[PDB]
Amino acid sequence: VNSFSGYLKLTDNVYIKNADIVEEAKKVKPTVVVNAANVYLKHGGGVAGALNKATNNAMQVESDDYIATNGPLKVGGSCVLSGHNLAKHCLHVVGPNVNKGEDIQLLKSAYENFNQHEVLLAPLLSAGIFGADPIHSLRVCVDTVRTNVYLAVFDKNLYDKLVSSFL
Numbered sequence: 309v310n311s312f313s314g315y316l317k318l319t320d321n322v323y324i325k326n327a328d329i330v331e332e333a334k335k336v337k338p339t340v341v342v343n344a345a346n347v348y349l350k351h352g353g354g355v356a357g358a359l360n361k362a363t364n365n366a367m368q369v370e371s372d373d374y375i376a377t378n379g380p381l382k383v384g385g386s387c388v389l390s391g392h393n394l395a396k397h398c399l400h401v402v403g404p405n406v407n408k409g410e411d412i413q414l415l416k417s418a419y420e421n422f423n424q425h426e427v428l429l430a431p432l433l434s435a436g437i438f439g440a441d442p443i444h445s446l447r448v449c450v451d452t453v454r455t456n457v458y459l460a461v462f463d464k465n466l467y468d469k470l471v472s473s474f475l
């Protein structure tokens with residue numbers, strides 16, 4: 309039993325809700341919140357911009373030190389950093405950004421990072437400003453993630469289409 313509330317159960321281990329991931333994380337304070345990161349951990353917009361703003365830029369400060377030490381992530385890769393005031397940990401995961409020409413096949417590799425964590429609060433990878441089809445992202449999530457994932461979908465209109473179209 310966990311403290312996630314109001315989710316629709318899609319499969320044994322995948323759950324979905326219309327919610328602002330920022331407000332969800334503050335309410336739940338989960339062990340792991342997933343950020344929709346880019347390889348530079350520059351949290352300028354989308355989910356990343358919103359998560360960072362909620363930390364008063366502390367996420368960005370930590371991230372800049374991480375990059376200065378380690379260099380950029382790989383597309384499809386991840387790193388674990390602090391969750392700041394939002395969660396215990398933030399799993400920064402880089403899905404492909406279609407508006408950059410990046411191979412959508414890397415979306416499965418990106419979701420594989422979730423399997424290293426028993427429970428996660430997450431957005432749909434590569435959705436929004438990363439340019440991928442969210443219906444595809446949800447399908448890859450369900451077919452790749454085996455751990456318990458709580459998907460937060462900001463847009464109410466988008467949420468209803470994913471549910472009604474879910475196979």
Ligand SMILES: C[C@H](O)[C@@H](C)Nc1ncnc2[nH]ccc12
Nearest residue numbers: 328329354355358431435436462
């Ligand atoms: C599919 C996209 O990733 C879209 C659903 N992004 C988001 N999801 C949840 N919470 C959010 N807060 C700000 C952006 C955002």
Ligand SMILES: [Cl-]
Nearest residue numbers: 354355436437
């Ligand atoms: Cl977005």
